[PDB]
Amino acid sequence: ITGTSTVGVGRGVLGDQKNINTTYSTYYYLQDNTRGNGIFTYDAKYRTTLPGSLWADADNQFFASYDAPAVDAHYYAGVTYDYYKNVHNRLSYDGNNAAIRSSVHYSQGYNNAFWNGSQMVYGDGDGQTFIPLSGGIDVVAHELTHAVTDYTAGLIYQNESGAINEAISDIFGTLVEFYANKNPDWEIGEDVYTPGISGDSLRSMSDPAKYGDPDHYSKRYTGTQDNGGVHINSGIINKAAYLISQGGTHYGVSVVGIGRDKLGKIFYRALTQYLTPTSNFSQLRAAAVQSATDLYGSTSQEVASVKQAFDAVGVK
Ligand SMILES: NNC(=O)CCC(=O)O
Ligand SMILES: [Ca+2]
Ligand SMILES: [Ca+2]
Ligand SMILES: [Ca+2]
Ligand SMILES: [Ca+2]
Ligand SMILES: [Zn+2]
């Protein structure tokens, strides 16, 4: 809407206070005009019709329990925008400052979040498996990264291409979590998963097998569940990315880590210059090797480490 840019304050899903960019015109709206063509957060009001109504608040204070998922969806979308702009010189998901739209309170007891082709959508969880899913910065950045992928490589959402699509979202979701530097880790969803169980998460990048996901190509899922295992076989690529950044010896193959910032540069270049809608794992290895070569040189440690990491997970 048309109005003047303002700064509200509220509390997120985990009870942390944060400032949020709003817009005033009669009400205060969750509309951040400081980033691109705006970040807009909507109330789906427990329904499944999208987007719902642009979030409106009478006093610019967002401390009600009902407000918390909106505060975090809005704030973490901003952090993710800042990551892509400051770290990769990318302006929003399309590279042209497209407006970023999110809806919260989607459905009833909904244990998921997604990018629907046009916007991000967050359930509240059932209170046992999940709390509201926008409480996880890695979740928010994972979802916005699906938009980045769709506008760049365009990896189709099935089989190996879809597992790459998933791993890209887990990788950048994790790199955004490190960028914000609040309790960062290589786990996915730990801040919103199972409020009754400490120390778990939905997936692990450092040890995918902790939750049953494969960490080697020989262990890949070959059936039809989960669109051909997109959230399962992503573990193979997640492990490779983790090794590239942090190093390790895995199935007897030693990898010298090169750090998160270089991991991000290599995979961002692979995503935006070399991957295609039907790329498979072997083609991702080639894309990553070429990206590291472009950035660091063919004889560089960075290139050598990319090769070792894909070797360690059995991807030639
Ligand atoms: N394809 N989308 C989903 O399965 C929702 C969760 C995710 O973002 O991966
Ligand atoms: Ca209020
Ligand atoms: Ca964390
Ligand atoms: Ca995490
Ligand atoms: Ca938990
Ligand atoms: Zn995903």
Picking from 291, 242, 240, 243, the residue whose alpha carbon sits closest to that of residue 267 is: 291
Picking from 71, 196, 43, the residue whose alpha carbon sits closest to that of residue 130 is: 196
Strands 56-57, 17-25: pairing kind: unpaired
Same domain, residue pair 186 and 131: no
Q: Distance (Å, rounded) from C-alpha 135 to C-alpha 228?
A: 28
Kindly state whether residue 293 falls inside one of the protein's structural domains: yes
Same domain, residue pair 68 and 211: no
Same domain, residue pair 167 and 308: yes
Picking from 43, 40, 37, the residue whose alpha carbon sits closest to that of residue 22 is: 40
Q: Distance (Å, rounded) from C-alpha 242 to C-alpha 250?
A: 11
Residue 34: CATH number of its domain: 3.10.170.10
Distances (CA, A) of 32 to 68, 117, 290: 17, 21, 38
Number of domain units in the chain: 2
Q: Distance (Å, rounded) from C-alpha 209 to C-alpha 224?
A: 20
Q: Which residue range forms the structural domain that includes residue 123?
A: 8-151
Catalytic residue among 74, 88, 105, 143: 143
Joined together, the tokens standing for residue 46 give 């427990």
Q: Distance (Å, rounded) from C-alpha 132 to C-alpha 249?
A: 37
Q: Distance (Å, rounded) from C-alpha 241 to C-alpha 167?
A: 9
> Are 53 and 85 contacting, i.e. CB atoms less than 8 angstroms apart?
no
The number of beta carbons lying within 10 Å of the beta carbon of residue 28 is 22
Tell the residue number behind the tokens 């887990």, with chain if given: 170
Tell the residue number behind the tokens 């998901």, with chain if given: 93
The number of beta carbons lying within 10 Å of the beta carbon of residue 302 is 21
Annotation says 143 is catalytic: yes
Q: What is the 190 CA–ligand 3 centroid distance (Å)?
A: 6
Residue 18 bridge partners (DSSP): 10
Strands 100-106, 120-123: pairing kind: parallel
315's CB contacts (< 8 A; 6+ apart) are 217, 236, 240, 281, 282, 284, 285
Alpha carbons within 13 A on the beta-carbon side of 32: 29
- The method recorded for this entry reads X-ray
Picking from 114, 81, 151, the residue whose alpha carbon sits closest to that of residue 231 is: 114
Strands 17-25, 4-11: pairing kind: antiparallel
22's CB contacts (< 8 A; 6+ apart) are 5, 6, 7, 8, 28, 29, 30, 31, 32, 57, 60
114, 157, 193, 230: residue to mutate for ligand 1 pocket, most atoms within 8 A of CB: 114
For the CA of 146, the closest atom of ligand 1 is 8
- Write down which residue in 151, 184, 218 finishes a domain: 151
Please give the radius of gyration of the chain, using alpha carbons only, rounded to the nearest integer. 19
- State the ligand closest to the CA atom of 57: 2
